[PDB]
């Protein structure tokens, strides 16, 4: 790729962790040199703590700054809770309904059996439940899932596949429950 | 653990590249374009409901630059160890012939935050309609990145996401086809 000069990286992260709305908030400030976190400020601790010997100088120096410490201690409110409220409407409250399709897998390692794929895509937030039914009875064994795949554009997708030996007359159902809908979405495939 | 908002920034030498962004539960809210000194919202509508003063990012990045120099010295000039990316290509929805879709090239678990990505269609580079995100933070302190290519599915087209990174000895091509 060219230019093999050694590289030097410095990262700073201010993580605001929220539990039950803004009831419990934890602020975690961290410094990372290359791939090593050296020092951090954890609101539950209340002061800087070196994570490695390299960050010792900073934890001691910053902690000696009582004004900085107090600012950092009040941040759970002035920073975290404040920013949470700022975008609550298009983040915490964002809802996009999943598009659900079902199709038999074009790839079948061995005839007789089969694989039904339930594709659930374009949804937000991540919380979702996808279930497979056979003639209305829930299928629990034979089901595998990709889990949540974040698309990077505020949308998720997942694939939930049912291994089955379909018999004419059977009715297969993929059912999806997600915060964006009040009743489950269902798509059926008739063998 | 219900929600997490992160303000992540970085500065890299000798490239002299810095980045400033906010993310919510892993998705980018916005970042600051350093050359235009402006806030860039991941989804256009976010900007219609909130604002951020970009100059503040500029001031933090200057401090990050200065701090990188300090740590570079303190570590006796220990450089970063390259970690090559994992690359996967998928569509954002099931593909149906002659129905518009989008190829997603997911570049994950790499560092430093410098990469070259190119979409190929039948071996030739394509640029029309493509987009990408900035470098997104990971809990292990590596990075993730997404590149996108809107396309019209066809039975003959073969696509590649070509990725180059210092941790790789050669270009890594991840293929996709209907």
């Amino acid at each position: 790729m060219g230019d093999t000069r050694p590289r030097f990286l410095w990262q700073l992260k201010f993580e605001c962790h929220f539990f039950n709305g803004t009831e419990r908030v934890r602020l975690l400030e961290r410094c990372i040199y290359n791939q090593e976190e050296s020092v951090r400020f954890d609101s539950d601790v209340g002061e800087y703590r070196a994570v490695t010997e390299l960050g010792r100088p900073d934890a001691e120096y910053w902690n000696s700054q009582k004004d900085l410490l107090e600012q950092r201690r009040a941040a759970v409110d002035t920073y975290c809770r404040h920013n949470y409220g700022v975008g609550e409407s298009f983040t915490v409250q964002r809802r996009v309904e999943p598009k659900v399709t079902v199709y038999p897998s074009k790839t079948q390692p061995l005839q007789h059996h089969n694989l039904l794929v339930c594709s659930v895509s374009g949804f937000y937030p991540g919380s979702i439940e996808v279930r497979w039914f056979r003639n209305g009875q829930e299928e629990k064994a034979g089901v595998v899932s990709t889990g949540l795949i974040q698309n990077g554009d505020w949308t998720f997708q997942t694939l939930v596949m049912l291994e089955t030996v379909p018999r004419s007359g059977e009715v297969y159902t993929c059912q999806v429950e997600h915060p964006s809908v009040t009743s489950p979405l269902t798509v059926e495939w008739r063998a | 653990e219900e929600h997490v908002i992160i303000q992540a920034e970085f500065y890299l030498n000798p490239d002299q590249s810095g980045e400033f962004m906010f993310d919510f539960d892993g998705d980018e809210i916005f970042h600051v374009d350093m050359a235009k000194k402006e806030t860039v919202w991941r989804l256009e509508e976010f900007g219609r409901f909130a604002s951020f003063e970009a100059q503040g990012a500029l001031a933090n990045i200057a401090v990050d630059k200065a701090n990188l120099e300090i740590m570079t010295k303190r570590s006796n000039y220990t450089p970063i160890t390259n970690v090559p990316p994992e690359v996967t290509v998928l569509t954002n929805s099931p593909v149906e012939l002659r129905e518009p879709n989008v190829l997603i090239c997911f570049i994950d678990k790499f560092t430093p935050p410098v990469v070259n990505v190119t979409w190929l269609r039948n071996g030739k580079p394509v640029t029309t309609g493509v987009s990408e995100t900035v470098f997104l933070p990971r809990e292990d302190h590596l990075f993730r990145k997404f590149h996108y290519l809107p396309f019209l599915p066809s039975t003959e087209d073969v696509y590649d996401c070509r990725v180059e990174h210092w941790g790789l000895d050669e270009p890594l091509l991840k293929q996709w086809e209907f």
Binding site: L12, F14, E29, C31, P57, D58, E60, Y61, W62, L68, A75, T78, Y79, H82, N83, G85, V86, G87 | Q7, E9, F22, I29, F30, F49, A50, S51, F52, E53, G56, A57, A59, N60, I61, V63, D64, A66, N67, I70, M71
Partner: peptide, 13 residues
């Protein structure tokens, strides 16, 4: 509604 950022702190020197 405006996002507020935490300021970067200069390291010990």
């Amino acid at each position: 509604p405006k996002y507020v950022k935490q300021n970067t702190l200069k390291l010990a020197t």
